[PDB]
Curated annotation (Swiss-Prot), chain A:
(Microbial infection) ADP-ribosylated on both alpha subunits by the phage T4 protein ModA. ADP-ribosylated on only one of the alpha subunits by the phage T4 protein Alt. Its EC number is 2.7.7.6. Keywords: Acetylation, ADP-ribosylation, DNA-directed RNA polymerase, Nucleotidyltransferase, Transcription, Transferase. Residues 1-229 are annotated as: Alpha N-terminal domain (alpha-NTD). It comes from Escherichia coli (strain K12). This is DNA-directed RNA polymerase subunit alpha. The chain holds residues 6 to 234 of 329 of the full protein. DNA-dependent RNA polymerase (RNAP) catalyzes the transcription of DNA into RNA using the four ribonucleoside triphosphates as substrates. This subunit plays an important role in subunit assembly since its dimerization is the first step in the sequential assembly of subunits to form the holoenzyme. Residues 157-160 are annotated as: Required for interaction with Crp at class II promoters.
From Swiss-Prot, chain D:
The RNAP catalytic core consists of 2 alpha, 1 beta, 1 beta' and 1 omega subunit. When a sigma factor is associated with the core the holoenzyme is formed, which can initiate transcription. The rRNA transcription and antitermination complex (rrnTAC) consists of RNAP, NusA, NusB, NusE (rpsJ), NusG, SubB, ribosomal protein S4, DNA and precursor rRNA; S4 is more flexible than other subunits. In pull-down experiments interacts with CedA. (Microbial infection) Interacts (via flap domain) with Escherichia phage lambda antitermination protein Q; this interaction renders bacterial RNAP resistant to transcription pausing and allows it to read through termination signals. Belongs to the RNA polymerase beta chain family. Acetylated on several lysine residues in the presence of glucose. This is DNA-directed RNA polymerase subunit beta. The chain holds residues 697 to 796 of 1342 of the full protein. It comes from the Bacteria. It comes from Escherichia coli (strain K12).
From Swiss-Prot, chain E:
This is DNA-directed RNA polymerase subunit beta'. The RNAP catalytic core consists of 2 alpha, 1 beta, 1 beta' and 1 omega subunit. When a sigma factor is associated with the core the holoenzyme is formed, which can initiate transcription. The gene is rpoC. Belongs to the RNA polymerase beta' chain family. DNA-dependent RNA polymerase catalyzes the transcription of DNA into RNA using the four ribonucleoside triphosphates as substrates. The chain holds residues 504 to 553 of 1407 of the full protein.
Length: 229, 50, 50, 100, 50, 219
């Protein structure tokens, strides 16, 4: 009986989306146990904030098309689904997108807010193809976790949403791929101490320093039952 | 109304009531068999491998 | 030529890679074939037939 | 697209009659996912005619199997095209190549 | 078809394998060994059977 | 509800026997059944600590290749059966016991030199059978405290050490539902232990260790 506890010795934020973090020291096997449990938890349960509804000024249904736009309304909605933003201390927010003139319509055109931060401003929503062409939409963003298809959503809302509100399927989970690599560390002049290095590719909304802590918190609280016998 | 209580009624009714499953073309008697049903979310019929 | 093209990438010339089971973190014994197959959704979806 | 095809798509998708094909060479002037108007170059312009060729793309329409057959553009405003080029991808086609 | 493949793979024996030649006090200990990764499935061993 | 994951209530703990039970957890979020079950297995099966025999010295024999007479079973069999012995050792790392027996009859675990600090949980554990009127054996059995299941990788004789008392743990996940969804997991855990530690507390320990390892990040 010599067990040591892991500590997040280092975190390397190599990019706005890709990062690595090392937990050290870890005894035998704990590298595998933590690496896989935390991988599953981070892939499944990490909350994020994603677009949930859209409302464009002059359109009626997603299958229609807007005048002077290169992308059909369906492709506009698909592009909006890929938008990734942060919100500061709110459960939902409504952002207006007001734009006109020939050229692209990028996420920068959205009316920025102090509590709303866009991870990739270079996101293109659609292309306007007329001098007087213009699109205004009211995007709705909600916090959450997991993936909520629109079919489940409207049938759980239990009220008839008005004509012109289009609903997109939200993928709240902000992490894309989580890999863990276990490798020895020179600690206390003794071997068989695994340094677990987790490298995660995210959308860029959350920082790993909080992601790993939330995953660990989830694991511990679920673990409460097995110690409650 | 597909009330959530109606599902409890179904889960009680279907408890021990066999259902006959009958792929067609049923050349031999082993093509029709009785099974104890269990509710599944999807729309496909879950069959046993063996 | 398939081998030559795999060699152009950093991919294994064997064509088969080792995978890890997501539920248990273990490595599958012996590598498995992994690639990009072009798949088509046939027009026989269940909701038209249940 | 298919990653591995046989090159036969570049013909099947064109001769299918489902994709909008540039009748003459020219330069794109306006696109709105419904009508693509081409400034057909004077080398093939009729002396008295307009000299500018529209293409009213067909949007969501029911097929014989109750499927949608909308055609979507792929060319860009100001892009030059030559007679026979695929302007708008039909259903199951993308960038002029069949993709089921 | 798949089950028999699984059993064929599980009960086969190899000449030299990890965990070969030791003595296991019972089937349970064998299973534990495998799940701890200390032994290979096709390893040759002497187990007390009842 | 972004931080409100479901917490299961144990349906049961069917102690099919004093050694093994069928602890079942229900319900768990989808994907949490394996995430918890495999981690508990990985703790119990290879990191649980306990005291087990690791070295043996039989009287006047150099190796199990040599099959000393007077005993019905051979030295290899003696070593495997001695490995099966479960012990509870209080407050020591390693101990040297002595087992001595004589007469026509079997040698049972009740015959060891009980120091009082050492508890042999199964006195009825059969060691071997003596096959002579003067048949007598005496051996020094080394016990050591450690963790996990140490193989034979290492006048002494080494034996595999079963420090972890969990003989077997196997778990299954299955569909369980609430009033509106059938995507949730019910976790059926089964474990059989050597008997020194009751299973229901064994899992309590396992979760203990894991939770401790999670302490530096959770707030």
């Amino acid at each position: 009986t010599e067990f040591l506890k892991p500590r997040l010795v280092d975190i390397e934020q190599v990019s706005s989306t890709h990062a690595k973090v090392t937990l050290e020291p870890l005894e035998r096997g704990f590298g595998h146990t933590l690496g896989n449990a935390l991988r599953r938890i981070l892939l499944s349960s990490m909350p994020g904030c994603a677009v949930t509804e859209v409302e464009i000024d002059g359109v009626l249904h997603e299958y229609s098309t807007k005048e002077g736009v290169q992308e059909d309304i369906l492709e506009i909605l698909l592009n909006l689904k890929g938008l990734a933003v942060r919100v500061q201390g709110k459960d939902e927010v409504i952002l207006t997108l007001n734009k006109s003139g020939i050229g692209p319509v990028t996420a920068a055109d959205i009316t920025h807010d102090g509590d709303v931060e866009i991870v990739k401003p270079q996101h293109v929503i659609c292309h306007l193809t007329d001098e007087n062409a213009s699109i205004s939409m009211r995007i709705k963003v909600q916090r959450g976790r997991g993936y909520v298809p629109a079919s489940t959503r409207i049938h759980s809302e239990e009220d008839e949403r008005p004509i012109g509100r289009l609903l997109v399927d939200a993928c709240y989970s902000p992490v894309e791929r989580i890999a863990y690599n276990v490798e020895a560390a020179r600690v206390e002049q003794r071997t068989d101490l695994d340094k677990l290095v987790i490298e995660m590719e995210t959308n860029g909304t959350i920082d790993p320093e909080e992601a790993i802590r939330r995953a660990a918190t989830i694991l511990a609280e679920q673990l409460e039952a097995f110690v409650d016998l | 109304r597909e009330e959530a209580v109606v599902w409890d009624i179904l889960d009680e009714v279907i408890r021990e009531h066999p259902v006959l499953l009958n792929r067609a073309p049923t050349l031999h008697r082993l093509g029709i068999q009785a099974f104890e049903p269990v509710l599944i979310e999807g729309k496909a019929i879950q069959l046993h491998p063996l | 030529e398939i081998k030559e093209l795999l060699k152009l990438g950093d991919l294994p010339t064997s064509g088969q890679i080792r995978l890890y089971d997501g539920r248990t973190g273990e490595q599958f014994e012996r590598p498995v074939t992994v690639g990009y197959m072009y798949m088509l959704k046939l027009n026989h979806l269940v909701d038209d037939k249940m | 697209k298919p990653l591995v095809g046989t090159g036969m798509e570049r013909a099947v998708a064109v001769d299918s009659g489902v994709t909008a094909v540039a009748k003459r060479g020219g330069v794109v002037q306006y696109v709105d996912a419904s009508r693509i108007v081409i400034k057909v170059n004077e080398d093939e312009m009729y002396p008295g005619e307009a000299g500018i060729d529209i293409y009213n793309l067909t949007k969501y329409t029911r097929s014989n199997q109750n499927t949608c057959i909308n055609q979507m553009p792929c060319v860009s405003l100001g892009e030059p095209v030559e007679r026979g080029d695929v302007l708008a991808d039909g259903p199951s086609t993308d960038l002029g190549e069949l993709a089921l | 078809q798949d089950v028999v493949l699984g059993l064929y793979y599980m009960t086969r024996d190899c000449v030299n394998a990890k965990g070969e030649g030791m003595v296991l006090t019972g089937p349970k200990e064998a299973e534990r060994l495998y799940r701890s990764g200390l032994a290979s499935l096709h390893a040759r061993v002497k187990v007390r059977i009842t």
